[PDB]
Amino acid sequence: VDLDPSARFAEYAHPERLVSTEWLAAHLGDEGLVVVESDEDVLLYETGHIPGAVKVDWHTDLNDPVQRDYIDGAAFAALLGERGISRDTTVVIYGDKNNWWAAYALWVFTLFGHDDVRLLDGGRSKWEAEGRAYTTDAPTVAATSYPVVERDDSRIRAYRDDVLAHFGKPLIDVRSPEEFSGARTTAPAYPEEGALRAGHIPSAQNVPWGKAAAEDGTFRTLAELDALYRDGAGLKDGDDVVAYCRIGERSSHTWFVLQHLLGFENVRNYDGSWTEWGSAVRVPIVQGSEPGEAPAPI
Amino acid sequence: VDLDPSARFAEYAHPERLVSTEWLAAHLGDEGLVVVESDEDVLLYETGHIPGAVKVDWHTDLNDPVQRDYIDGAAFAALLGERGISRDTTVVIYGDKNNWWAAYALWVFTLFGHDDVRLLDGGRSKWEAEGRAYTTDAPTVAATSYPVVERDDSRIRAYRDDVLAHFGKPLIDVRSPEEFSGARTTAPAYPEEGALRAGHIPSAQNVPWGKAAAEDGTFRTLAELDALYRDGAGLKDGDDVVAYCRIGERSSHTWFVLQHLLGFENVRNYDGSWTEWGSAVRVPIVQGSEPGEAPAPI
């Protein structure tokens, strides 16, 4: 299944990671293509979704049911086969909130080493605004076989003890400035994603995740994104960059911007994020909207 | 300042760690004695407190104001000097909820290597029930000098990574059975001490902390405590025992039972507790009222 030649994506480091609404519309039904809805609000799928599209539910499908971790490769294989996805399938993911969760799903696929995963620029917003068709029909899929591969946390995921040893290397905190400063422990809309303590990781640069998206829901031009991350947050070629929100689901979008649109080679998602960090014992915290000086590597 | 010869304390491993209401009443005003109120409800002090008694407020006095850790030895020295406590002072601590917080304060003193700290058996309850006098007078204290010593976390405190390496060695979870089982993430009365996930550390034995206390607020007889911890939770001589609640403040009472009343030589408080554990990434959790099989040391 082919690539989108849109001049807009061509400036980006990995244009192959993006498809337009017009490309996907032209490609609906193609053999080798499966469309996945990945929404923060999992109930949107049933309101209307892109024809042939399947749903991944972050509450039930992507997380261990009891323990705080992503599923293993057996459960991932059963998830993807049930949805007619094979190892070689081109997967295009779109969803609500400007592909916030679409990016998170893309990130989980990458842990499992699925190569051809792509975001539908503008997600549900831009499909809806261009008046393209939804269906409420439960799509009908022939089950396939998907290989059982071991999950790879090496390249794109950061644990707590990795972030403690990271000081002197750049940190992006993608949370509202009020959470950044420690004025709130969490966003108003998410009381259940609070922590004991308030502030940010010392030396973290506040880049709320929404700034990487235009009003239409598409990713900003490379130049605008260069302004934000290179000039604004002080990232340069070779930097080992860790991004964090409250939960890893919410820091996946920025991960995707840094790794696939700006082409930073070493980009890790700290999924523990503030829900872990603000409840952990004897981990560095500062308050105020100043990044802060980093302490000694722990 | 002398020891309480009460026959009741004499069976305990460290009788010197306990004083009765009748002993303290006989000893009020003695040079070398300072009484400390340590309450979960810090406002009780102002309702009426033991004459000459000072207050330690766990919200403001014992914790770093921003970061999740206990104060350092400079702030501890200033706390104790301000209250007329010198290195050689006998400190007797009492408070509400059957000395729940009194034990927590005793635990913080021990981190700072203060030797003669003692609990008033029965705390505020038993002082009140025997109709002994309170005052609402802000007591008046000559400031003393207290040495600056480095805080010792080696002997009585456990961090997360210590508990991950602890499997195959005994764990006491002192939380309500409903939190133990994962039916609730927290106790009804403490919504702000929840976690993302619910259950207990696999192989942990549920011994709610209240069972070590009689209805009067005194510690149970050694035999009753032997029933609970030795027979019930399967502790034997030489065991490295870690106890945990939601926060370390609440697991200090049990620590004090295991270390000073039963005389277990190696007893650590995991202060991170469930607020840390139930929000940490990729740490073992089980549900149900069965302890569970331990996994491999992490």
Residue B217 forms beta bridges with which residues?
A: none
Considering only CB atoms, B281 lies closest to which of A195, A272, A281, namely A272
Residue A275 with chain B: CB contacts under 8 Å: 196, 279
Judge: B282–A68 Cβ closer than 8 Å, yes or no.
yes
Q: Which residue of B has its CA nearest to A70?
A: B282
Assess contact for B68 and B193: CB atoms under 8 A. no
Q: Which two tokens stand for residue B23?
A: 């002993």
Residues of B marked as catalytic? 245
Quick one: tokens of A266? 């070493």
* Cα pseudo-dihedral A82, A86, A87, A88, rounded to 10: -150
CA distance A114 to chain B (A): 22
**Which residue is closest to A65 within chain B, CA to CA?**
B197
B286 part of contact set with chain A, CB < 8 Å: yes
User: Does residue A44 contact residue A102 with C-beta atoms inside 8 Å?
Assistant: no
Instruction: Please say whether the beta carbons of A90 and A116 come within 8 A.
Output: yes
Please give the Cα distance from A109 to B67 (Å, whole number). Answer: 35
Helix (H, G, I), strand (E, B) or coil at A157: strand
Return the structure tokens found at B72: 């350092």
Domains of chain B: 7-129 (3.40.250.10), 157-277 (3.40.250.10)
Q: Choose the mutation target among A271, A279, A283 for the interface with B, i.e. most B CBs under 10 Å.
A: A279
- Among the listed residues B228, B242, B232, the one whose alpha carbon sits nearest the alpha carbon of residue B273: B242
Residue whose C-alpha is closest to residue B99's, from B131, B122, B70: B122
A199 closest CB neighbour out of B66, B279, B284 = B66
Interchain proximity A66–B275, CB inside 8 Å: no
Residues in chain B closer than 8 A to A159 (CB atoms): 281-282
d(CA A247, CA A269): 10
**Which residue of chain B is at minimal alpha-carbon distance from A272?**
B281
What secondary structure does DSSP assign to chain B, as a single string?
Answer: ------HHHHTSS-GGGEE-HHHHHHHTT-TTEEEEE--SSGGGGGG-B-TT-EE--TTTTSB-SSSSSB--HHHHHHHHHHTT--TT-EEEEE-HHHHHHHHHHHHHHHHTT---EEEETTHHHHHHHTTPPPB-S----------------TTTEE-HHHHHTTTTS-EEE-S-HHHHHTSSSS-TT-GGG--SS-SB-TT-EE--GGGGB-TTSSBPPHHHHIIIIIIIT---TT-EEEEE-SSHHHHHHHHHIIIIIS--SEEEEESSHHHHHTTSSS---B-SSS--PPPP--
Does the beta-carbon distance from A67 to B284 stay under 8 Å?
Answer: yes
Structural biology method used: X-ray
How many contacts (CB atoms, under 8 Å) link A and B?
77
What is the longest distance spanned by two Cα atoms in chain A? Answer: 56
Sign of CA pseudo-dihedral B267, B272, B278, B283: negative
A59 vs B210: CA distance, rounded Å: 36
Alpha-carbon distance of A194 to A274, in angstroms, equals: 8
List active site positions of A: 245
CA distance A248 to A276: 10
Cα separation, A30 vs A40, in Å, equals 27
B159 touches chain A (CB under 8 A): yes
User: What are the residues facing B119 on neighbouring strands?
Assistant: B18, B93
The Cα-based distances of B65 to A242, B82, B180, B242 in angstroms read: 26, 19, 30, 26
Residue type, B58: W
Residue B66 near chain A (CB below 8 Å): yes
CA distance A64 to chain B (A): 10
- For an interface test with A, give the residue of B163, B242, B274, B282 to mutate (most A CBs within 10 A): B282
Quick check: A285 and B159 CB within 8 A? Answer: no
Retrieve residue A28's tokens. 């609906």
The answer to whether residue A65 neighbours chain B at the CB level (below 8 Å) is: no
B22 to chain A nearest CA, in Å? 40
Which helix (H) or strand (E) segment holds residue A277: the answer is: helix A273-277
DSSP-derived secondary structure letter, A155:
T
Q: In Å, how far is B138's CA from the nearest CA of chain A?
A: 32
